[PDB]
Design a protein around this ligand. Structure first.
Ligand SMILES: *[C@@H]1O[C@H](CO)[C@@H](O)[C@H](O)[C@H]1NC(C)=O
Ligand SMILES: *[C@@H]1O[C@H](CO)[C@@H](O)[C@H](O)[C@H]1NC(C)=O
Ligand SMILES: *[C@@H]1O[C@H](CO)[C@@H](O)[C@H](O)[C@H]1NC(C)=O
Ligand SMILES: *[C@@H]1O[C@H](CO)[C@@H](O)[C@H](O)[C@H]1NC(C)=O
Ligand SMILES: *[C@@H]1O[C@H](CO)[C@@H](O)[C@H](O)[C@H]1NC(C)=O
Ligand SMILES: *[C@@H]1O[C@H](CO)[C@@H](O)[C@H](O)[C@H]1NC(C)=O
Ligand SMILES: *[C@@H]1O[C@H](CO)[C@@H](O)[C@H](O)[C@H]1NC(C)=O
Lengths: 201, 595
């Protein structure tokens, strides 16, 4: 039948500002029609690494809920948003499960997210005591203790502020330019799946 | 929980905050160097100040970790690099006096003006005029006047300055658990803690002696030939049995002999290989020159240039309204940013320098995966050596015939190879004994082997004994004749040129046996050879993380400095010099018989 009520992918993809990778935004997508053919057909969206589902058959399989996690990282850590990899982003900021059903989308945003003075509004967590659970968000600013004496909240010797800043500049190499990453996770629940793609006449 | 993890976390914090207080410093220095304006001057000053203060406080926080309980070699190397005091170990008054001394040496050398007596209405500076009068004049007494006047003025205005400078630097080195300041400078080659690859500070000098003992015969033949050609230049003033007069070496100090090519040509009837006319007739602009150098580097297998390199580099002089430093410099700004500042003219020399600086940029590009404090050459010679091998390979006639600069009907006979090799010998072998003499004199004067009132007598004797060059007139200790050079007056290590010169031909032999070259070494090209590029990139990717002995064993299959590649490079020039030195006398006498 005649289709309307498109899923709000424009508020996720064409947003003016994305969140930091430590405080990654999660948007739930339900009860709408999800046209994935727009994302595949845009040439600036260079990396379309989809895991657990084929990108050609994304338009027919229907899912219960779609989770859009949006953040900004550098060029070299785009490969770390994947199952089984390790590093600062995988351990401390955003961890993907090994049985991950969903696609990742990443594109360069050097024209938008870089300033000549340098952009300091984007932060990542560098030191955590334990590796993160999958899909866990940690927004704590407690002082990281690398030594033996207690820090007591004062960033002195062997006490570091756990969150640093990505100083994006329009003059950085491809491995240090800002990359906007949106991860779509597709989940099925005992509930009737109401997030489906369009049907052709 | 342990000390090593504490060191690792501290080093991670240090590596981040530093890749940023550097890229801000390097961007500001770049904006000053391409645009000389006072706001760029103060930007460079504030960023240099914030960078020096950052490393001061980070070394203060880094010296709280003792090194004897760290077993990982990379963390130990990074902490050894970080914990170096520098000038901070002294009291504040002596450090301030040392910085004042260094600044006034810089201002005396930069603003040193020496001109003719009785003509004071204007006078002539060293870099504009004295270089030209040393390189272009053919008059004996004119060069003698310029030489003696400049050496006299600078020696009288620098001798007590060096007298205090040696004492302050000796106190700094003995406070830094070094034997002398010479031990502090030889400590750059020191390797400790690695089994089989251990290298001490003291061995390098005898290693240099072991190389120089085999350097000395080839240079002797070149010296005899130069003496014969100087017999053509100066009939009666130079003695056949004696050493060369000091103010006849084509430069102010005798460091390079390349200004003697007109006088010392082997075959003047043969043309040179200057390809400037072919570039200017076909309008070869600088952008496509760098594109051609990139094509050479992707022919050998190295990765090509970044897009930001082509966007951000200034490969042409910008104009009259914007003033820029004309020195060719390769800039590694950090964060994957690589630029070349070069005001290119359409000549063959600028073509070779563009190949040299793109080799510099490739060397900086390869160790980008290393941690920040390990992002350097394995020693101070490798970084310039890997650019000089590219300058060697790009200058071959085969490469110029490959890229269309040289005609396919060019005849490569042995005579043009002989005169090209003599030009390369005047550039390369001539500077080796001057460099070894100057560094060994400086090592003994820092060690205290040379007494304080015996400097000039010892120094000139060294120049007589090592370089085979005699002074025009005797000089007493009111003069400081060493201090007239740029590097010694501004606190620079000088043995890097000797080690670079040896490593250049060692790397050239290693690549030419990697590329299966079946002839002599000077007609070899590493183009279109992927295995040689892989063999080189195996060393370029290490950076400073491994000992330089291990990198040398990775390239040339030897763990120690070798002079055999250098004499193998100049073998046909050596046989030619043996052929035409039959009438002349090889060797010199220490008497002052020439002058
Ligand atoms: C965002 O803007 C582009 C502009 O070309 C448009 O094509 C696209 O439909 C918009 N929405 C999304 C979700 O990309
Ligand atoms: C160089 O500096 C001057 C003075 O600040 C400025 O007017 C000019 O635009 C600068 N040139 C460039 C290429 O930025
Ligand atoms: C030293 O630490 C680094 C971590 O940066 C590690 O990769 C390396 O394997 C360690 N060295 C040894 C010999 O274990
Ligand atoms: C640096 O100087 C301080 C002050 O004298 C000293 O305590 C420290 O041991 C020095 N460190 C090194 C590596 O020489
Ligand atoms: C470098 O080479 C790669 C392929 O080898 C190519 O994709 C890239 O565009 C090249 N870069 C430039 C600046 O030409
Ligand atoms: C060059 O080769 C020719 C013929 O082989 C020979 O006669 C001549 O002496 C050689 N000259 C030099 C400088 O090698
Ligand atoms: C190297 O390869 C390029 C392209 O294949 C070719 O044009 C060039 O002539 C080769 N170099 C030599 C020395 O043959």
């Amino acid at each position: 039948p005649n289709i309307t009520n498109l899923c709000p992918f424009d508020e996720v993809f064409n947003a003016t500002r994305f969140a930091s990778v430590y405080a990654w935004n999660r948007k739930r997508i339900s009860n709408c029609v999800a046209d994935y053919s727009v994302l595949y057909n845009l040439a600036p969206f260079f990396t379309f690494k989809c895991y657990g589902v084929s990108p050609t058959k994304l338009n027919d399989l229907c899912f219960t809920n779609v989770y859009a996690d949006s953040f900004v990282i550098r060029g070299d850590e785009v490969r770390q948003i994947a199952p089984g990899q390790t590093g600062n982003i995988a351990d401390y900021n955003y961890k993907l499960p090994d049985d991950f059903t969903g696609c990742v989308i990443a594109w360069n945003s050097n024209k938008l997210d870089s300033k000549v003075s340098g952009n300091y509004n984007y932060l990542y967590r560098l030191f955590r005591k334990s590796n993160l659970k999958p899909f866990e968000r940690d927004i704590s600013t407690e002082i990281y203790q690398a030594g033996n004496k207690p820090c007591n909240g004062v960033a002195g010797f062997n006490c570091y502020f756990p969150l640093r800043s990505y100083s994006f500049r329009p003059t950085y190499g491809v491995g240090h330019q800002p990359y906007r990453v949106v991860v779509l996770s597709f989940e099925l629940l005992h509930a009737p799946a109401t997030v489906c793609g369009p049907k052709k006449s | 929980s342990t000390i090593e993890e504490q060191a690792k976390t501290f080093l991670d914090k240090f590596n981040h905050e530093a890749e940023d207080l550097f890229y801000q410093s390097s961007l500001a220095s770049w904006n000053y160097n391409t645009n000389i304006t006072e706001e760029n001057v103060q930007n460079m000053n504030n960023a240099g100040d914030k960078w020096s203060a950052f490393l001061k406080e980070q070394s203060t926080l880094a010296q709280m970790y003792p090194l004897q309980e760290i077993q990982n070699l990379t963390v130990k190397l990074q902490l050894q690099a970080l914990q170096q005091n520098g000038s901070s170990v002294l009291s504040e008054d002596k450090s301030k006096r040392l910085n004042t001394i260094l600044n006034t040496m810089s201002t005396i050398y930069s603003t040193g003006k020496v001109c003719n007596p009785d003509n004071p209405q204007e006078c002539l500076l060293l870099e504009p005029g004295l270089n030209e009068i040393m390189a272009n004049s053919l008059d004996y007494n004119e060069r003698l006047w310029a030489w003696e006047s400049w050496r006299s003025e600078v020696g009288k205005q620098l001798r007590p300055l060096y007298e205090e400078y040696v004492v302050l630097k000796n106190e700094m080195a003995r406070a830094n658990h070094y034997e002398d300041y010479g031990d502090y400078w030889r400590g750059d080659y020191e390797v400790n803690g690695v089994d089989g690859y251990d290298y001490s500070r003291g061995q390098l000098i005898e290693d240099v002696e072991h190389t120089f003992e085999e350097i000395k015969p080839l240079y002797e033949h070149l010296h005899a030939y130069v003496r014969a050609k100087l017999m053509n230049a100066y009939p009666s003033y130079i003695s056949p049995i004696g050493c060369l007069p000091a103010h006849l070496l084509g430069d102010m100090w005798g460091r390079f002999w390349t200004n003697l090519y007109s006088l010392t040509v082997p075959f003047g009837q043969k043309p040179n290989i200057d390809v400037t006319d072919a570039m200017v007739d076909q309008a070869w602009d600088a952008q496509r020159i760098f594109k051609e150098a990139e094509k050479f580097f992707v022919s050998v297998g190295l990765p090509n240039m970044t897009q930001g390199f082509w966007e951000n580099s200034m490969l042409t002089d910008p104009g009259n309204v914007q003033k820029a430093v004309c020195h060719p410099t390769a800039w590694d700004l950090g964060k994957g940013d690589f630029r070349i500042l070069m005001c290119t003219k359409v000549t063959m020399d600028d073509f070779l320098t563009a190949h040299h600086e793109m080799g510099h940029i490739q060397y900086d590009m390869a160790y980008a995966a290393q941690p920040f404090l390990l992002r350097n050459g394995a020693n101070e010679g490798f970084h310039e050596a890997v650019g000089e091998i590219m300058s060697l390979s790009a200058a071959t006639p085969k490469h110029l015939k490959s890229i269309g600069l040289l005609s396919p009907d060019f005849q490569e006979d042995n005579e043009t190879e002989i005169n090209f090799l003599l030009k390369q010998a005047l550039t390369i072998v001539g500077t080796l004994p001057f460099t070894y003499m100057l560094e060994k004199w400086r090592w003994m004067v820092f060690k205290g082997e040379i007494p304080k009132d015996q400097w000039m007598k010892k120094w000139w004797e060294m120049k007589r004994e090592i370089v085979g060059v005699v002074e025009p007139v005797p000089h007493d200790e009111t003069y400081c004749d060493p201090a007239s050079l740029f590097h010694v007056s501004n606190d620079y290590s000088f043995i890097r040129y000797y080690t670079r010169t040896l490593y250049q031909f060692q790397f050239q032999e290693a690549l030419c046996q990697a590329a299966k070259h079946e002839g002599p070494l000077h007609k070899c090209d590493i183009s279109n050879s992927t295995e040689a590029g892989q063999k080189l990139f195996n060393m370029l990717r290490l950076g400073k993380s491994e000992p330089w002995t291990l990198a040398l064993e990775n390239v040339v299959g030897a763990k120690n400095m070798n002079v055999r590649p250098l004499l193998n490079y100049f073998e046909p020039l050596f046989t030619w010099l043996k052929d035409q030195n039959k009438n002349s006398f090889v060797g010199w006498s220490t008497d002052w018989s020439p002058y």
